[PDB]
Amino acid sequence: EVETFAFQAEIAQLMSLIINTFYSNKEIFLRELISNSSDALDKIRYESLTDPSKLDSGKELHINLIPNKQDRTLTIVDTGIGMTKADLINNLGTIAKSGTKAFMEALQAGADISMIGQFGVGFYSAYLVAEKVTVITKHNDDEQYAWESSAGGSFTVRTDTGEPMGRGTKVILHLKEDQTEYLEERRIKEIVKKHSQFIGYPITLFVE
Numbered sequence: 001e002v003e004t005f006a007f008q009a010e011i012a013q014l015m016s017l018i019i020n021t022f023y024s025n026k027e028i029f030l031r032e033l034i035s036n037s038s039d040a041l042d043k044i045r046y047e048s049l050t051d052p053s054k055l056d057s058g059k060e061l062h063i064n065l066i067p068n069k070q071d072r073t074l075t076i077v078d079t080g081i082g083m084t085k086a087d088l089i090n091n092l093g094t095i096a097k098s099g100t101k102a103f104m105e106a107l108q109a110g111a112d113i114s115m116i117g118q119f120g121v122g123f124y125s126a127y128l129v130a131e132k133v134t135v136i137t138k139h140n141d142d143e144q145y146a147w148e149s150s151a152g153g154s155f156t157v158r159t160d161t162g163e164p165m166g167r168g169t170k171v172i173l174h175l176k177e178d179q180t181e182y183l184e185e186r187r188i189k190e191i192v193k194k195h196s197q198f199i200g201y202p203i204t205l206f207v208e
């Protein structure tokens, strides 16, 4: 059973701006998603210090980048704390509202789209390169969920019956047809070294 939700108006406006504005420096999406993975990994590691059983769902803390040219997907997998249903359908949108308004106002003051992560809404930079984003996520003591959106003001959430993840988040970027450079080994490596050089978890770039 699939539930369909409306983005809050401010977040829909942000996604439209990301999709419609001319902006050539699209590669920043990868830094923003890796940063989110790193923050999620930080949090499970921190919480496991007072409750070690939180690592029963998996002790390894890492980030994997997986291109698939046949499916035209770039997938980013981490074993961080994951997201609850409440995060997905209600609570993260509430935090995104204030960040979006601030980011909007910064853009009119002369800020650049690459600063999106300073306003806590860097995830939506995925829409610089993806026509559809599918997010599989598993938080301890909650179900595995699949979040999905092709923008247009709505997203879906369902309980996911695919391959169990144990714990963490998997962001599946269905790339636009003119954005397949982000499937190339040399290009991904270039971007990670330039923008994500000091991330404190092993990042593995899969090849095909």
Ligand SMILES: Cc1ccc(Sc2cc(C(=O)N3Cc4ccccc4C3)ccc2O)cc1C
Pocket (backbone or CB within 6 Å): 032, 033, 034, 036, 037, 039, 040, 043, 078, 080, 081, 082, 083, 087, 088, 092, 123, 135, 137, 147, 168, 169, 171
């Ligand atoms: C709603 C939403 C928000 C971010 C993303 S992208 C995204 C989210 C996560 C995740 O599970 N997090 C992020 C974070 C930072 C701090 C603390 C805890 C947690 C949990 C990890 C990697 C990502 O690339 C996707 C969606 C669907």
